[PDB]
Design a protein around this ligand. Structure first.
Ligand code: ATP
Ligand code: ATP
Ligand code: ADP
Lengths: 533, 209
């Protein structure tokens, strides 16, 4: 059945060094031992396995490599969603056509037939727990029955192997995972350092063989820089780097006098890697640098001590979350008066944290959604956050997320309960998390018994003295010395209570008049606005 | 043999360690069948899905000659919120019907509860179903606090002596999990300023019963 034309090195899989050893020991330890002993023991072969993990980490590759290694026939790749049909009896026919060749060859060549391999993709899109209550049957009760009957029925097949692949392993039936049916489970996770080195070596072997690499390309660096890259986004990086190198070469010669031999020598690639890494690849489980422009519009500018106090508190919380081991889950709430700029400080803490995973959950992308969809979105974000050795998630404008309105009061309970349950669920073993929240109405949250779930509170104050306002104006740099002195004389009284956002709006508005009438309008607007709580 | 079904409720204040004690009582019983029905595996479910999940767990429990089922965080299952009040009637009725349904002949069961709000559960006429209740208290003395500090093994001798003087002359109403949180949050300062921060946090947290 097996021939010596297979070696592990030639396969080309890097990072799965246990997910293969254990599989080989368990599933395929009876397909290689001499037939005499196996027959004497009288043991049946395993009839399939299940692979789960994030998307794009090398599961299909492993299935095809197993198929080639076992000297099987051509696998019948299938797609889960493309089996269903709207007529009465068409889905079951599609599920039944796959098991035809094995049945035909089992009754003709006796017990000396080949090995047929069947591959399912997204196996959980068809098989879901079957209802129990009378009249509570689902719409896909018939597909599951057909699949169960075919895999292990009254007529025995001993020349088949079934591989299933899925991402959500908690929705599959429970009679489809017992010893005899799919009975071996393995997990394919994100690669680690020594798993991101092997992939790069495998992918640059070709360039090294054909003598295209430069003399300064260091692979330890490239292994270190990419932190949460999945296996499918390193080949993209390599190819993008080579493509930009070629583009540079071509456009150079046309507007350069390099020379043909000079161009060939220039074909080497050293910094294209760095440039492409910077501005070509966007990971799916990594920090995003494109959002901090949307939430930090005018940057953080100091106008007092409270800014420093808040930032230091955030730093201490980050340190605690990183180092301690008795408490792997931490939380904190930022609350203050409206227009005080809380989201900006939350984003600043998150971005200065230096964590591999950073994400922001906000209602800006949830216009028109029904509560159930909002629950699904929140759960998806947290599920993606549970797949890293460090992380941090920010929840914005909790009151807007609950659909609150003072009349009534009226709000939604499903979202509140989901949120109150997701603040106390610890991650898998050995991983850490950090959750930040922002709100303006703390008392309403206090009534909802949602304020003691968080582990700490931080106050974001408001401008409260004239000198602070003058210093903020100086930092902004709009009004000249004489105008500043006039304002200082006018507003020397320390009775100012204004938000840093309303102040920017006021300054922008007041600059729409002639130079003569500038200070008067600004002072009139400031006086008209509230002067105390 | 007269009573093939029993129930019990563990209740106390928040942050006191009810789930841990329920799990430890369940683990040391050597029952062939043990299971836990928690609400963190039911995020986003509607009423009927929760009913079906509970019913399935009990149906499975009814097929062993001995059993033990744990139902924790009862108030999160009912979706309770003081404003209103609001909650789910269907789940409440399902639970109240399942609490007093004997298994087939010859088989035995045991149900353990958990909750931090006993009065609310009493308003709905639910403490009538449970056979009896147990009380889990907090730390309510300086001596017990010192014993807990010694057993956790964090602060050294001299710092222990410093803590002793400022604590024995008052009372304390801190839970046990919150104590771990405070100890962890204090150790992030420089060697000199650890005891001061711990005392400040403890004084802030402490409140009358
Ligand atoms: N020291 C500062 N702190 C916060 N924001 C600042 C500071 N200096 C400048 N800003 C700018 O102020 C704006 C902060 O607005 P932001 O959206 O954070 O307000 P908010 O308090 O969250 O709003 P809302 O009233 O809608 O809740 C951003 O443009 C930020 O760049
Ligand atoms: N003697 C003890 N009793 C209970 N828990 C203890 C004890 N010693 C240490 N612990 C630990 O304290 C923590 C108690 O947290 P736990 O989840 O049990 O609290 P809880 O009562 O369920 O809280 P909540 O009020 O939030 O529902 C667990 O880590 C438990 O291991
Ligand atoms: N362990 C690995 N070693 C080498 N390449 C990998 C590995 N995992 C994933 N890849 C890359 O991923 C690509 C295909 O992945 P794919 O089969 O789509 O993953 P999945 O089946 O999980 O969607 C290939 O081009 C391959 O280079």
């Amino acid at each position: 059945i097996i021939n010596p034309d297979w070696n592990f090195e030639k396969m080309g899989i890097g990072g799965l060094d246990k997910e293969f050893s254990d599989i080989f020991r368990r599933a395929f330890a009876s397909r290689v031992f001499p037939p005499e002993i196996v027959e004497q023991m009288g043991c049946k072969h395993v009839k399939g396995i299940l692979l789960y993990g994030p998307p794009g980490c090398g599961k299909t590759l492993l299935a095809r490599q197993i198929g080639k290694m076992l000297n099987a026939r051509e696998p019948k790749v299938v797609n889960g969603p493309e089996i269903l049909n709207k007529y009465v009896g068409e889905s079951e026919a599609n599920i039944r056509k796959l098991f035809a060749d094995a049945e035909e060859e089992q009754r003709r060549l006796g017990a000396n037939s080949g090995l047929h391999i069947i591959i399912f993709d997204e196996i959980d899109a068809i098989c879901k727990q079957r209802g129990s209550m009378a009249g509570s049957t689902g719409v896909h009760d018939t597909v599951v029955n057909q699949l169960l009957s075919k895999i292990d029925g009254v007529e025995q097949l001993n020349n088949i192997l079934v591989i299933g692949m899925t991402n959500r392993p908690d929705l599959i039936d429970e009679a489809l995972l017992r010893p005899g049916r799919l009975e071996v489970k393995m997990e394919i996770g994100l690669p680690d350092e020594k798993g991101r080195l092997q992939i790069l070596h495998i992918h640059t072997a070709r360039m090294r063989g054909h003598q295209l690499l430069s003399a300064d390309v260091d692979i330890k660096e490239l292994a270190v820089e990419t932190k949460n890259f999945s296996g499918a986004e390193l080949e993209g990086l390599v190819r993008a780097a080579q493509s930009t190198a070629m583009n540079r070469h071509i456009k150079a010669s046309t507007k350069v006098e390099v020379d043909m031999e000079k161009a060939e020598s220039l074909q080497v690639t050293r910094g294209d890697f760095l440039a492409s890494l910077e501005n070509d690849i966007k990971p799916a489980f990594g920090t995003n640098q494109e959002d901090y422009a949307s939430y930090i519009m005018n940057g953080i500018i100091k106008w007092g001590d409270p800014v420093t106090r808040v930032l230091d508190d955030g730093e201490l919380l980050v340190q605690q979350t990183k180092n301690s081991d008795r408490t792997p889950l931490v939380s904190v709430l930022l609350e203050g008066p409206p227009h005080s700029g809380k989201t900006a400080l939350a984003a600043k803490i998150a971005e200065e944290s230096n964590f591999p995973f950073i994400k922001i959950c906000s209602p800006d992308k949830m216009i028109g959604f029904s509560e159930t969809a909002k629950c699904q979105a929140m759960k998806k974000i947290f599920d993606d956050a549970y797949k890293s050795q460090l992380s941090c998630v920010v929840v914005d404008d909790i009151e807007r997320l609950l659909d609150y309105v003072p009349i009534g009061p009226r709000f939604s309970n499903l979202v509140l309960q989901a949120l109150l349950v997701l603040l106390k669920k610890a991650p898998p073993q050995g991983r850490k998390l950090l959750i930040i929240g922002t709100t303006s109405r703390k008392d309403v949250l206090q009534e909802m018994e949602m304020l003691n779930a968080f582990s700490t509170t931080i106050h974001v104050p408001n401008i409260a003295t004239g000198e602070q306002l003058l210093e903020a104006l100086e930092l902004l740099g709009n009004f000249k010395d004489k105008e500043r002195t006039t304002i200082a004389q006018q507003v020397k009284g320390k009775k100012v209570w204004i938000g840093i956002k309303k102040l920017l709006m006021l300054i922008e508005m007041s600059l729409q008049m002639d130079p003569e009438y500038r200070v008067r309008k600004f002072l009139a607007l400031l006086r008209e606005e509230g002067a105390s709580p």
